[PDB]
Amino acid sequence: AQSVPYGVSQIKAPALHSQGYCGSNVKVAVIDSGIDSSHPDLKVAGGASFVPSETNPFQDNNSHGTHVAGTVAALNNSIGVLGVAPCASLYAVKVLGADGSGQYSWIINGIEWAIANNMDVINMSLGGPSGSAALKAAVDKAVASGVVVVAAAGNEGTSGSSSTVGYPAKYPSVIAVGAVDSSNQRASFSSVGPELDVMAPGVSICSTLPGNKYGAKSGTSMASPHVAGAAALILSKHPNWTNTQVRSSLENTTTKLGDSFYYGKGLINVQAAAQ
Ligand SMILES: [Ca+2]
Ligand SMILES: [Ca+2]
């Protein structure tokens, strides 16, 4: 039997699924540790590896990329879980190794690849404490080219009065995503700052794991794919909307929570964003 992770229902994805909107023909790139393409609950359409020692993008030695990918697009069938946009075209852009780290050069190569391959939506559930002109340029180019770029805000929690949002989430062109639990409370780990845009479920998220498994993970890494998935549903409904329009709609129809420094605009609601 298939189970629907709490987070999927919390952002109101099932309402669209019911209407026949599931992300068909929307190309979503998961820039992460790869995706196990052998998992029976995922369908990988393509991708590329930018990790010099791990050339197959379809082998996930970490487990993180696979878990993120399932939140976006675990298939609607009779097994496992259900993603936010189960009919999307999923691309594994491998830029992290088995240990979950990666060089900026690799990440940027992955972004360049996504632009050139006409991805509609980019998901980056990764972050570093420092930026670079090259990192900023790549994300800015993707947005200028019409791509929706979503990133995890970071797991740094609070720090006096400063922003703890990492890069690339800090860049204005990117949608920076913080995490809430099932009760809509901000997770204590979720990074904070004026750059935070939206929140999504990120505590104990059940998703796919390599080797035909399923398990829960917590983090703003788990939050970001709910938003990437959300963008894919919107585009399946409104194929001629620009990335700007998709983004404004998501931001403009959230359920407001606390202060923007901690919650951004609040929790996304895809049903309201889809008009
Ligand atoms: Ca399934
Ligand atoms: Ca922002």
Side-chain angles (χ1 to χ4, degrees):
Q2 181 165 266
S3 297
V4 180
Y6 82 83
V8 176
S9 306
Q10 191 174 351
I11 64 152
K12 298 177 195 168
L16 302 188
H17 302 161
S18 280
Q19 305 168 321
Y21 297 114
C22 58
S24 316
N25 310 124
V26 181
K27 292 183 174 187
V28 177
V30 176
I31 302 188
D32 210 301
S33 72
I35 300 165
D36 181 4
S37 73
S38 74
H39 201 289
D41 216 23
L42 292 173
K43 185 79 191 167
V44 177
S49 178
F50 297 93
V51 178
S53 55
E54 293 187 32
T55 58
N56 188 341
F58 315 119
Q59 278 188 217
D60 174 14
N61 297 314
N62 180 280
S63 75
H64 188 268
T66 300
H67 195 281
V68 166
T71 295
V72 182
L75 298 169
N76 185 25
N77 55 18
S78 77
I79 53 161
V81 295
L82 182 65
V84 179
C87 302
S89 294
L90 189 65
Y91 287 77
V93 182
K94 187 178 198 167
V95 303
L96 309 178
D99 70 3
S101 71
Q103 298 291 319
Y104 268 41
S105 54
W106 324 329
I107 300 158
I108 300 171
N109 282 344
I111 302 161
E112 283 285 16
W113 183 90
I115 304 164
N117 293 270
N118 307 137
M119 297 294 108
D120 291 304
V121 183
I122 280 167
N123 184 79
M124 289 183 286
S125 279
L126 55 76
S130 46
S132 78
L135 185 65
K136 189 176 196 290
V139 297
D140 286 355
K141 173 179 182 191
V143 167
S145 288
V147 182
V148 181
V149 182
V150 186
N155 304 324
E156 308 300 309
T158 71
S159 185
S161 68
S162 299
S163 165
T164 63
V165 175
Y167 294 89
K170 232 189 182 63
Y171 299 131
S173 68
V174 178
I175 297 165
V177 184
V180 293
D181 66 26
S182 73
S183 72
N184 291 338
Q185 179 67 252
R186 164 187 162 273
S188 62
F189 59 78
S190 192
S191 280
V192 303
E195 304 89 354
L196 192 56
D197 300 300
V198 294
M199 307 291 275
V203 177
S204 203
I205 301 299
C206 180
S207 187
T208 44
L209 296 176
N212 191 23
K213 289 168 203 294
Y214 306 88
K217 299 188 181 293
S218 293
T220 55
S221 277
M222 287 60 255
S224 187
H226 291 80
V227 186
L233 296 178
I234 293 164
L235 287 165
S236 69
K237 182 164 177 177
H238 306 281
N240 300 306
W241 273 24
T242 66
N243 55 350
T244 308
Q245 290 165 308
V246 169
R247 181 188 183 149
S248 279
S249 185
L250 279 170
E251 282 183 11
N252 299 333
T253 61
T254 54
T255 300
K256 299 184 172 191
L257 305 177
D259 190 78
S260 67
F261 190 101
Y262 295 88
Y263 291 89
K265 271 81 187 171
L267 178 70
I268 59 154
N269 178 343
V270 75
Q271 184 189 27
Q275 297 165 45

